Design a binder for this molecule. Structure first.
Ligand SMILES: COC(=O)Nc1ccc2c(c1)NC(=O)[C@H](C)CCC[C@H](NC(=O)c1ncn(-c3cccc(Cl)c3F)c1C)c1cc-2ccn1
Lengths: 7, 238
């Protein structure tokens, strides 16, 4: 996805 | 939601029902999965909530009747309210819930994309407000997730409709000039999802309005694009 949030 | 239709299972898989346990278990607000341990909702939802221990997040739900004592949920480790937040009408109506466990992504529960810095310029013609909220100003929470397609409105147009208020660029408005279709009590915190280039983006968080679905009264949403840095700040902390 465009904007990435750490898992 | 006012003037909406039942959603189809798996339609808004980022939509969650945020429940409270104190005094009794009940739906509180809507919210959106934006990361595997992150829920994005409205700051106003936690008025008087003194602990995250009373919160339960339910993903992959169409009907509130699916929620029983045996229903699995996500516990809340932390409530992160924007530190500039006073009230919904003044803005900064944004909150992050850090979940105690990881959301396993599938066809029933998955994250919505955040708007990109370049997406600040784009238009959006396919926007939908979702929720379990009231169908009219005095009503009750709905069993089935409702949806309503809502057109975006300029900040300028939204400001004429809200004399005595200050509509900031950190707010985004949506509504029909004649009303009829809108969000209502119980939908707040939930998403305003807009499809662009076959990809859904979280353009807004249901925040405030005067009544529900009234003519010349657009719904006011937190403009998520203006809080991408703040979301990354709180979720990507070293
Ligand atoms: C069995 O379980 C239940 O029956 N649960 C239940 C029932 C009612 C409510 C509730 C929980 N939640 C709350 O009390 C929490 C603490 C939130 C408080 C503020 C919230 N405001 C809104 O939802 C709300 N305020 C303005 N708008 C608005 C109107 C048009 C367009 C746009 Cl874009 C707008 F955002 C909305 C959707 C609200 C929610 C309820 C009542 C009154 N206000």
């Amino acid at each position: 996805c465009t904007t990435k949030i750490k898992p | 939601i006012v003037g909406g239709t039942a959603s189809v299972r798996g339609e808004w898989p980022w939509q969650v029902t945020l429940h409270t346990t104190s005094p009794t278990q009940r739906h509180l607000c809507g919210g959106s999965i934006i990361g595997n341990q992150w829920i994005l909702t409205a700051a106003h939802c936690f008025y008087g909530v003194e602990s995250p221990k009373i919160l339960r997040v339910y993903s992959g739900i169409l009907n509130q009747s699916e929620i029983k004592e045996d229903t699995s949920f996500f516990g809340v480790q932390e409530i992160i309210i924007h530190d500039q937040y006073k009230m919904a009408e003044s803005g900064y109506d944004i909150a992050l819930l850090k979940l105690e466990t990881t959301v396993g992504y599938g066809d029933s529960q998955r994250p919505i994309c955040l708007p990109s810095k370049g997406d600040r310029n784009v238009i959006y013609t396919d926007c939908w407000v979702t929720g379990w909220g009231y169908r009219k100003l005095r009503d009750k929470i709905q069993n089935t997730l409702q949806k309503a397609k809502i057109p975006l409105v300029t900040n300028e147009e939204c400001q004429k409709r809200y004399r005595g208020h200050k509509i900031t660029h950190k707010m985004i408005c949506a509504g029909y000039r004649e009303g009829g279709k809108d969000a209502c009590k119980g939908d707040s915190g939930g998403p305003l999802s807009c499809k662009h280039n076959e990809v859904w983006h979280l353009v807004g968080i249901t925040s405030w309005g005067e009544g529900c679905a009234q003519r010349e009264r657009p719904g006011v949403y937190t403009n998520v694009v203006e809080y991408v840095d703040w979301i990354l700040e709180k979720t990507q902390a070293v």
